[PDB]
Amino acid sequence: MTNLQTFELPTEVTGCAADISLGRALIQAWQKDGIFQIKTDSEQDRKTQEAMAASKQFCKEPLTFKSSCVSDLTYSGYVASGEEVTAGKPDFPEIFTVCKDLSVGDQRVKAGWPCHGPVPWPNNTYQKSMKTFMEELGLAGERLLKLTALGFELPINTFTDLTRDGWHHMRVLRFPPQTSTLSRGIGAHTEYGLLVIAAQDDVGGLYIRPPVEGEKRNRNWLPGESSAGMFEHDEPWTFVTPTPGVWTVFPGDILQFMTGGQLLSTPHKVKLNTRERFACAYFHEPNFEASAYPLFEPANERIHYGEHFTNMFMRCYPDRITTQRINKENRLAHL
Numbered sequence: 020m021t022n023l024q025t026f027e028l029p030t031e032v033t034g035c036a037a038d039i040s041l042g043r044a045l046i047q048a049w050q051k052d053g054i055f056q057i058k059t060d061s062e063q064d065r066k067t068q069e070a071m072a073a074s075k076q077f078c079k080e081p082l083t084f085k086s087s088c089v090s091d092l093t094y095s096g097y098v099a100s101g102e103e104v105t106a107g108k109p110d111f112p113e114i115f116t117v118c119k120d121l122s123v124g125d126q127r128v129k130a131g132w133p134c135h136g137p138v139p140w141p142n143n144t145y146q147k148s149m150k151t152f153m154e155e156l157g158l159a160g161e162r163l164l165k166l167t168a169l170g171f172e173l174p175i176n177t178f179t180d181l182t183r184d185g186w187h188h189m190r191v192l193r194f195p196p197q198t199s200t201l202s203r204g205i206g207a208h209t210e211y212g213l214l215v216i217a218a219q220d221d222v223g224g225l226y227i228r229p230p231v232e233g234e235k236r237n238r239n240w241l242p243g244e245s246s247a248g249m250f251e252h253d254e255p256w257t258f259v260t261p262t263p264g265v266w267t268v269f270p271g272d273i274l275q276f277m278t279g280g281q282l283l284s285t286p287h288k289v290k291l292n293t294r295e296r297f298a299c300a301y302f303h304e305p306n307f308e309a310s311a312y313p314l315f316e317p318a319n320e321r322i323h324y325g326e327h328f329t330n331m332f333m334r335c336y337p338d339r340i341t342t343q344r345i346n347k348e349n350r351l352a353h354l
């Protein structure tokens with residue numbers, strides 16, 4: 020809580036002795052702190068700062084242009100400050116969401132799969148910066164998933180077998196400065212996939228909740244057990260202090276389900292600061308068609324990830340044209 024643990028990942032994870040020891044240490048760090056940091060090399064750091072710069076430049080565009088970067092096929096594109104709701108309350112960052120960039124010629128888009136479509140990019144320079152960043156983030160996610168399997172003494176590709184053509188996506192965020200009566204950036208929530216890899220500038224605002232002995236956690240993938248808003252005003256909340264040259268990593272709903280709670284989907288929230296805050300949250304996700312399964316309970320329960328993703332994003336954006344078209348064309352009922 021006072022100081023987060025920081026790890027260096029190897030370029031390749033093969034299953035050697037050092038890989039197993041590192042994977043164990045990563046799991047223990049999650050089980051104690053709910054989060055850890057990983058050191059970035061010069062290339063990872065450059066691509067991070069390049070993405071932040073593109074984010075700041077895009078936010079300087081007029082609102083009428085930013086609001087035009089929307090799609091009714093995919094949730095990729097702009098989200099205005101105040102548009103997204105968490106636990107019914109408006110969240111206040113402006114966001115650009117980057118999901119899998121699929122042309123209208125892609126077979127899944129022609130088949131009308133929910134959430135599948137081309138990103139409404141503001142320009143190609145912004146596109147190149149975000150795609151390059153997400154390639155680098157994906158390499159880290161695969162390393163982390165192999166180390167996580169090794170740390171549980173599972174076959175090395177237990178999780179990466181679910182992430183071939185994974186539904187990886189990213190939220191490019193700018194939080195506005197606070198007012199005297201409003202400091203809620205995003206309410207307490209958990210993410211939906213396997214891993215969250217996050218970067219931030221030096222302003223500060225992210226808080227996470229570590230595992231708490233005796234504290235039962237809602238299973239955000241079940242009806243009536245949303246994690247949105249839970250524990251929001253009760254300690255403990257660890258401040259994720261801005262630290263140069265690191266990314267933060269914590270698990271999502273799928274890891275909690277697959278490990279039977281031995282890993283918890285880390286609740287987190289953002290408070291507005293006295294200055295605007297830029298951050299990027301990347302989500303290393305299963306394939307949209309993947310079905311996650313219990314690893315430690317020899318059980319019929321499954322999570323169809325794509326269904327979880329679509330359910331979650333419709334609850335984030337009930338009035339977005341993407342949500343309207345899913346309802347109008349029964350795209351989720353179809354799924």
Ligand SMILES: NC(=[NH2+])NCCC[C@H](N)C(=O)O
Nearest residue numbers: 103104105106205208247335
């Ligand atoms: N699309 C997201 N990842 N949103 C993160 C914030 C929480 C989200 N509004 C929810 O209700 O679950």
Ligand SMILES: O=C(O)CCC(=O)C(=O)O
Nearest residue numbers: 190217219225289298300
């Ligand atoms: O602001 C951050 O660092 C993370 C924001 C976040 O949790 C999210 O967008 O899901």
Ligand SMILES: [Fe+3]
Nearest residue numbers: 209210287300
């Ligand atoms: Fe989040």
